[PDB]
Amino acid sequence: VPEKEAIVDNGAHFDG
Amino acid sequence: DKWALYVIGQYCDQSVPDGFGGTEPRITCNAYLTTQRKAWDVLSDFCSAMRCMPVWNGQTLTFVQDRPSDKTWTYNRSNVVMPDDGAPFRYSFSALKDRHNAVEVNWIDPNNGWETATELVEDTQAIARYGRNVTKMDAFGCTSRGQ
Amino acid sequence: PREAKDNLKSTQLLSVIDAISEGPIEGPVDGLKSVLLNSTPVLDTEGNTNISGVTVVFRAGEQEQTPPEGFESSGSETVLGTEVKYDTPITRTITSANIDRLRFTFGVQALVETTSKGDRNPSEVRLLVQIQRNGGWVTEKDITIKGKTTSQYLASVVMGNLPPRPFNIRMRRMTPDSTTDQLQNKTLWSSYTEIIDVKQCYPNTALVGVQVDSEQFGSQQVSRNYHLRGRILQVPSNYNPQTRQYSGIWDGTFKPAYSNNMAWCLWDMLTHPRYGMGKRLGAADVDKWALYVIGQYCDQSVPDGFGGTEPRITCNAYLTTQRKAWDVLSDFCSA
Amino acid sequence: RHNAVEVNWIDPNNGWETATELVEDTQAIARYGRNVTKMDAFGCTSRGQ
Amino acid sequence: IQTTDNGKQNTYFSSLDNMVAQGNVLPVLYGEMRVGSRVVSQEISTADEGDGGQVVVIG
Amino acid sequence: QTTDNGKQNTYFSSLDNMVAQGNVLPVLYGEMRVGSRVVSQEISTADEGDGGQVVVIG
């Protein structure tokens, strides 16, 4: 799941 | 791999929001390692606290940083061995009771006198629907709430 | 010669809420007569009020409860009674998530000042409450107390609209210090409270909740022990819990009533939909008939060892620690 | 094959705390020795029970 | 020669009972038992009844 | 109470235990206050009292 650094230290939105 | 380490250092020297409205270096040490621990376990705690994993090449030791990396190898039906039963790839999933959505991180707060302190971090949207699983952890060189 | 007579007094009200049990429960086994503080009942066997300046309210369990009156706004409170120096602040970073008002309780060990020919005097010490507020500390409150005392004197201040809550507070003392024995004005920060400014009823729990005023009391953390009586099961209709007499042919259909009958406790554990097994089984998947037989077996009278007689088996557990459902089921079924 | 138990129960008469009622089968004791074992009666509050 | 009555002392709820901790499950009570306390809201309000308000607050 | 004037002499009663063999000399990595790992603790005592009232032979 590459877009994980984004989710942790940016609070970015990814959908489950 | 002093080169790999140099990259890693540059990364964990980045300026990040502190949590009390200031800026702050991303990761920093501030440990006082005061027991004999196994060399590999210590090395792993370092390379866990900064996001990477230690790779014994066989020849040298490097750090592969847990990031979107280019150079992605490809594997399909025609590439991996085919056993007698037609199952090239076997998958296996972590148990729900092992997926956590709350953690107690232990760090050493200088500001209330240098004693252990716990910051609880949770994922509300996840708690909302998948119940609420908490675990513990110790961040390795941590003396900042931000970290 | 000597002091000013008396000038700084103050008094403490402690307001706790004790959420015990779960679901609509019977309640105190006599009334106020069985709510021992420290170890001594609130009203003695006669009905004389043995303890003064003590309220106790009590909600049973009903889905439709009313907030416990005398609690207007329920809040947590961390006691950290600790001295404050001239060039040492404190700081706490309150870091709760919901918090609306914030209460500081500060005071002094003594505020006497002495001259020649006795002439003990008031001392007029000064402190400062601050918040991190963006950059660096800014003052929220700045208190100056005048008078003498000979022992502790605590006063409170509270405040509202706290900043967003990876927060930061701080208390510090402005008077140089007590170099000499003649003037002692050492300050401590007893405890601070986090006030939540919401009236919440706890929809299905059996909270007790007591107040004490310390001036009509003796200090000792108010260690509370209720002699209660437990959940109100569904027991089979035609069962009299008073007499443990079963009327005729039961024909199923339970009615609400408080009982010790241990088989009907197990019926509750297995079928209750909220805190039991009522999502995973159903009343259908428990053979209530075999229970019916077993509960009758429980209620037979047997020698009591001393010379009386008693029901063969009763319950009387206060199941406190979460265990595996099957293990509970089987410890019931082994009793 | 224990022949003598220590049963734990909550006694509302030394203030509600743990009491152990011992039980022994003296017949078996006399001729296999003495096996004592623990156990906690589940909802028990009566010395009889 | 002239004794000082020194007035009333004051008692302050020295120790406080611990609150309950998340994750901790709400017990179930079945017939009788004499329980203890699971605190879910413990709060201390201090008030004065001296000889005025010689305690000054700003802001 | 005519005369018993004298500074109440004070003495180090309790003392830190020494560090035990095989205990690893620790590493400190940036900042952090540390306790004590005592490797040589010695009490020298003296006297400044009004003359010498202690006699020792051999």
How distant, in Å, are the alpha carbons of B119, C221, C299 from that of C256? Answer: 46, 38, 18
- Characterize the bridge pairing of strands C228-231 and B53-56: unpaired
How far is the C-alpha of C94 from the C-alpha of C132, rounded, in Å? 11
Tell whether E34 is within 8 A of chain D (Cβ): yes
Query: Quick check: helix, strand or coil at residue C123?
Result: coil
E34 to D15: CB separation less than 8 angstroms, yes or no: yes
Cα E14 to its chain centre, rounded Å, is 8
The answer for residues whose C-beta is within 8 angstroms of residue F58's C-beta and 6 or more apart is none
Whole-angstrom Cα distance, residue C199 to residue C52?
A: 26
Are F29 and B31 inside 8 Å of each other by CB? Answer: yes
Q: Which residues of C touch E10 (CB under 8 A)?
A: 9-12, 151-154, 214-215
Q: Is C10 on the interface with E (CB under 8 A)?
A: yes
Method: cryo-EM
Distance CA B10, CA B14 (A): 7
Amino acid residing at B21: G
C-alpha–C-alpha distance, residues B30 and B107, integer Å = 10
Distance between CA atoms of residues C209 and E42, nearest Å = 9
Tell me how many residue pairs between chain D and chain E have CB atoms under 8 A apart. 10
C151 vs E9: CB contact, 8 Å cut-off?
yes
Residue C290 DSSP class: H
Closest by CA position to C281, among listed C296, C299, C268: C268
Rounded to the nearest angstrom, the minimum Cα separation between A8 and chain B is 11
Tell me which chains share at least 3 CB pairs under 8 Å with chain B.
Answer: A, C, F
* Contact by Cβ (8 Å): B33, B42: yes
Backbone angles phi, psi at E38, to 5 degrees: -115, 100
With an 8 Å CB cutoff and a minimum of 3 pairs, decide whether chains E and A touch: no
First to last CA, chain D: 22
From the candidates C145, C320, C329, which should be mutated to test the interface with E, based on the most E CB atoms within 10 A? C320
Q: At what angle do helices C325-332 and C262-271 cross, to 10 degrees?
A: 160
C118 and C218 Cβ atoms separated by less than 8 Å? no
List all chains that touch chain E, counting a touch as 3 or more CB pairs closer than 8 Å. C, D
Distances (CA, A) of C240 to C153, C249, C258, C298: 58, 14, 10, 14
Nearest to C318 by CA among C194, C227, C186, C224: C227
Q: Cα angle vertex C142, ends C140, C144, to 5°?
A: 160
What lies within 8 Å, CB to CB, of C228 at 6+ separation is: C20, C21, C25, C26, C27, C28, C29, C34, C206, E29, E33, E34, E35
Chain D partners within 8 Å of E32 (Cβ): 12, 45
Nearest to D16 among E30, E31, E33 (CB): E33
* Cβ-defined contact of E34 to D45 (cutoff 8 Å): no
Strand ranges for C185-314 from DSSP E: 187-195, 206-207, 210-213, 224-226, 228-231, 234-236, 239-240, 245-246, 254-256, 301-303, 309-311
* Structure-block tokens of residue E13: 């709820």
Residues 6+ apart with CB under 8 A from D31: none
For residue A2, the one-letter residue type is P
User: What count of residues does chain D have?
Assistant: 49
Runs of H (alpha helix) within chain E: none
* In chain C, residues 212-271 whose CB comes closer than 8 Å to chain E: 212, 214-215, 217-231, 258-260, 265, 268-269
Half-sphere exposure of C261 (CA within 13 A, CB side): 30
CA distance B146 to chain F (A): 17
Q: Touching check for B143 and chain F: CB below 8 Å? A: yes
- Taking alpha carbons only, the member of C223, C219, C241 closest to residue C232 is C241
- In Å, how far are B19, B104, D4, E45, F13 from C194, measured between CA atoms? 21, 21, 55, 12, 43
Check if B68 contacts A (Cβ < 8 Å): yes
Resolution of the entry in angstroms: 3.5
- Residue B145: name the closest of B14, B16, B10, B12 by CA: B16
Other CB atoms within 10 Å distance of the CB of residue C103: 19
- Residue C74 buriedness (CB in 10 A; 0-12 / 13-18 / 19+): buried
3-state secondary structure of C27: strand
Q: How far apart are CA B119 and CA B124, in angstroms?
A: 15
Provide the 3-class DSSP secondary structure of residue C291.
helix
Terminal C-alpha separation, chain A? 12
Interface residue E21 vs chain C (CB under 8 A): no
Query: Residue C324 carries which side chain, given as an amino acid letter?
Result: K
Polymer length in residues for chain B: 147
**Buried b / exposed e along C1-13 (16+ C-beta atoms within 10 A):** eebbebbbbbbbb
The 3-state DSSP class for residue C313 equals coil
User: Å from A1 to nearest chain B CA?
Assistant: 9
- Of B110, F32, B69, the C-alpha closest to C93 is B110
D18 vs E contacts (CB less than 8 Å)? none
Check CB contact of B112 with chain F, cutoff 8 Å: no
Angstrom distance (rounded) from CA C318 to CA C22: 11
Going B133 to B134 to B138 to B143, the CA torsion angle's sign is: positive
Of E29, E31, E49, the CB nearest to C11: E49
The radius of gyration computed from the CA coordinates of chain C, to the nearest angstrom, equals 28
Q: Is C81 in contact with C191 (CB distance < 8 Å)?
A: yes
Classify residue F4 by burial, with Cβ atoms within 10 Å: 0-12, 13-18, 19+: exposed
- Whose CA is closest to B31, among C98, F32, F42, F5? F32
Rounded distance between C-alpha atoms, residue B33 and residue B31, angstroms: 6
Contacts of C119 (CB under 8 A, 6+ apart): C1
Looking at residue B42, the DSSP 8-state letter turns out to be H
- Rounded distance, CA C32 to CA C115, Å? 53
Q: Which residues, listed in sequence order, are joined to residue C154 by a DSSP beta bridge?
A: C107
For testing contact with chain B, the best of F32, F33, F34, F37 (most B CBs within 10 A): F32
Chain E closest CA to D12's CA: distance in Å?
A: 8
Residue in B30, B108, B114 nearest the CB of F29: B30
Neighbours of chain C (3+ CB pairs under 8 A): B, D, E
Tell me the C-alpha distance between E32 and C315, whole Å.
9
Looking at the partner chain, which of B16, B51, B68 has a beta carbon nearest the beta carbon of A2? B68
Take residue C120 and report the two structure tokens written for it.
């003990």
Chains D and A touch each other (3 or more Cβ pairs < 8 A): no
Q: How far apart are CA A2 and CA D13, in angstroms?
A: 65
Position C248: which residue type?
G
User: Which helix (H) or strand (E) is A5 found in, with range?
Assistant: helix A5-10
Q: Which residue has the tokens 């399909």?
A: B76
CA distance B108 to F30: 13
CB atoms C74 and E49 under 8 Å = no
Q: How far is D28 from chain C (nearest CA, A)?
A: 22
Which of C 165-194 lie inside 8 A of B, CB atoms?
166, 168
Burial of C201 (0-12, 13-18, 19+ CB in 10 A): middle
Quick one: which of B138, B85, B86 has its CA closest to B116?
A: B138
B119 lies within 8 A of chain C by CB? yes
Q: CA-CA distances (angstroms) from residue F9 to C239, F41, F50, F51?
A: 81, 21, 14, 16
Burial of B73 from C-beta contacts in 10 A (0-12 / 13-18 / 19+) = exposed
Instruction: Note whether A5 contacts B67, CB cutoff 8 Å.
Output: yes
DSSP symbol at C243: T
- Among C80, C81, C78, C83, CA closest to C173: C83
* Helices and strands counted in chain D (H then E): 1, 3
